[PDB]
Amino acid sequence: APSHVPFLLIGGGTAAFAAARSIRARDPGARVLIVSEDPELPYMRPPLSKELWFSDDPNVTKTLRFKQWNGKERSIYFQPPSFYVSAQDLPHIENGGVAVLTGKKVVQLDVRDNMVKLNDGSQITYEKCLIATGGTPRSLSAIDRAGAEVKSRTTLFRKIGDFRSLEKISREVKSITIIGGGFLGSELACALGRKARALGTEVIQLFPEKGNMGKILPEYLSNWTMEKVRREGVKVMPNAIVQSVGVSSGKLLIKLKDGRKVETDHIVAAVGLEPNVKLAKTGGLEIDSDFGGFRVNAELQARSNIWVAGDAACFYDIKLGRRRVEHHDHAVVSGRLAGENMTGAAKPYWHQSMFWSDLGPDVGYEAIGLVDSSLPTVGVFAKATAQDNPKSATEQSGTGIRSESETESEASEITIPPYGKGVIFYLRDKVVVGIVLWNIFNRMPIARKIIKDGEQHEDLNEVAKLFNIHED
């Protein structure tokens, strides 16, 4: 570990990588150190629950290369390992570079001193610091009460190391249970379900809601989604609240509050995240008590020379106010912006971050703004053409990272032109405050503009025609 680095990026995920890239774009002599508690160099998370499981290629667990839905291979890593310089070389190497200290954790932050201390005792001073620590998976309290035998047979799915362990479990055991009905839980259900159809084994998905993604999607589409996951072979148990987990026979026994017993060999928990804010206390840094995460100003600053980006940040959304998100898009754009600000840009974060999820190559969702199933919603559906699927969208764009194909921009203008797919408008009064797109692609710029303008929209059916017609 060097003693000092001009740019110190704490955490080695998506936000950290985008900030490193941005810093080096604006200052090509810059010396950037990423400190990553994981053994792996920076990598994107979306394939871990999607294309890596759909690959029929051997070796996938070793190589972490995946085929997109269009059949083109891509690495999980943001860049080849050859592109980084060594941490030892970074302070003096000609033209600077980006180094990663892997397997190291920042445990203390000294803001007054512009210094951090690592788990190994090392001290690093900085000029400009980014906190991009992401978040930690939530447990289920019934699992924490359970024996050591239960805990060792529970995966909190989040990293490469979890893909590798679970993929092997999937080939060894007869039954895996996913707890959580959210996008990630549902992705993993389809993933494991596909492998289990091959092996003749069992996959269960359980959650308290009436259908998959029940907190976000309206009842019709949530149920549709549950049927789709069931068509994959998965036993989906909605209305399921876990009372306890123990052991009975040679199995884990999950007892639901309603009396149902579920027997299984392994549990995967996908019940959300908590931002990694441990450094706030030594730092004296403000955390948002309502939403979680480090509070940041318009420019993503927590202090004059500390920025925060990605899952860890609680920022003021241009239209929603204070919020935190768990969006790949946000981690990329806020990371990039934080890097620009670290190099003097003084730019505010005005981005409206999008989210996507794929349940295999034939089903895709996108979301933007305030998407909460308890709001009044208006769904406008149409029938799918051959191109209304994540596969075609990947084929047209060359990428399956939907935030790249959609673009980050908002449309210039909205003027109106005089089920398998659709748009769901989420309303506050009769203002569209959020939108979900189901099998509709390359219209995020439009959805951003509709939410941004915040006009009253009486006839949402005319507005829907922007989504339901060809792109095109």
Ligand X SMILES: Cc1cc2nc3c(=O)[nH]c(=O)nc-3n(C[C@H](O)[C@H](O)[C@H](O)COP(=O)(O)OP(=O)(O)OC[C@H]3O[C@@H](n4cnc5c(N)ncnc54)[C@H](O)[C@@H]3O)c2cc1C
Are residues 356 and 369 in contact, defined by beta-carbon separation less than 8 angstroms? Answer: no
Are residues 300 and 308 in contact, defined by beta-carbon separation less than 8 angstroms? Answer: yes
| Closer by beta carbon to ligand X, 21 or else 327 | 327
| Closer by beta carbon to ligand X, 156 or else 433 | 156
| Helix/strand/coil for 87 | coil
| Closer by beta carbon to ligand X, 132 or else 363 | 132
Find the shortest distance in angstroms from Cβ 58 to ligand X.
22
Q: Which residue has tokens 């596969």? A: 391
Q: What's the token pair of residue 308? A: 């925060």
Find the shortest distance in angstroms from Cβ 52 to ligand X.
10
| Helix/strand/coil for 400 | coil
Contacts of 294 (CB under 8 A, 6+ apart): 131, 275, 277, 280, 285, 286, 287, 288, 302, 308, 312, 313, 314
| Closer by beta carbon to ligand X, 226 or else 354 | 354
Q: How many whole angstroms separate alpha carbon 297 and alpha carbon 311?
A: 15
| Closer by beta carbon to ligand X, 19 or else 463 | 19
HEC per residue, 90-135: CCCCCCCEEEEECCCCEEEEECCCCEEEECCCCEEEEEEEEECCCE
Cβ count within 10 A of residue 83: 11
| Closer by beta carbon to ligand X, 150 or else 354 | 354
Task: Name the binding residues for NAD(+).
Answer: 69, 181-184, 209, 215, 272, 326-327, 356, 366, 442
Find the shortest distance in angstroms from Cβ 354 to ligand X.
7
DSSP 328-363: HHHHHHHHHHHHHHHTT---------EEEEESSTT-
Q: Is 428 left (phi over 0), alpha (psi -120 to 50) or beta?
A: beta
DSSP assigned state of 26: H
| Closer by beta carbon to ligand X, 157 or else 426 | 157
Are residues 448 and 410 in contact, defined by beta-carbon separation less than 8 angstroms? Answer: yes
Find the shortest distance in angstroms from Cβ 313 to ligand X.
8
Q: What's the token pair of residue 228? A: 């789709």
Find the shortest distance in angstroms from Cβ 50 to ligand X.
7
Find the shortest distance in angstroms from Cβ 291 to ligand X.
15
Task: Name the binding residues.
Answer: 11-15, 37-38, 45, 50, 69, 106, 158, 181-184, 209, 215, 272, 311, 326-328, 356, 366, 442
Find the shortest distance in angstroms from Cβ 155 to ligand X.
11
DSSP assigned state of 145: H
Q: How many whole angstroms separate alpha carbon 327 and alpha carbon 446?
A: 19
Task: Name the binding residues for FAD.
Answer: 11-15, 37-38, 45, 50, 106, 158, 311, 327-328, 356
Contacts of 137 (CB under 8 A, 6+ apart): 156, 157, 158, 269, 270, 271, 272, 273, 274
DSSP assigned state of 2: -
| Closer by beta carbon to ligand X, 146 or else 232 | 232
How many residues belong to the chain? 472
Find the shortest distance in angstroms from Cβ 100 to ligand X.
10
Find the shortest distance in angstroms from Cβ 83 to ligand X.
18
| Closer by beta carbon to ligand X, 11 or else 422 | 11
306: β partners: 129, 303
Residues in the site for ligand X, rule: CB under 6 A? 10-16, 35-38, 45-46, 48-49, 105-106, 132-134, 157-158, 184, 276, 310-312, 326-329, 331, 355-357
Handedness of CA 398, 400, 402, 403 (dihedral sign): negative
Find the shortest distance in angstroms from Cβ 311 to ligand X.
4
Find the shortest distance in angstroms from Cβ 132 to ligand X.
5
| Closer by beta carbon to ligand X, 146 or else 364 | 364
Q: How many whole angstroms separate alpha carbon 37 and alpha carbon 17?
A: 14
| Closer by beta carbon to ligand X, 146 or else 275 | 275
- Note the Cα 260 to chain centre separation in Å: 32
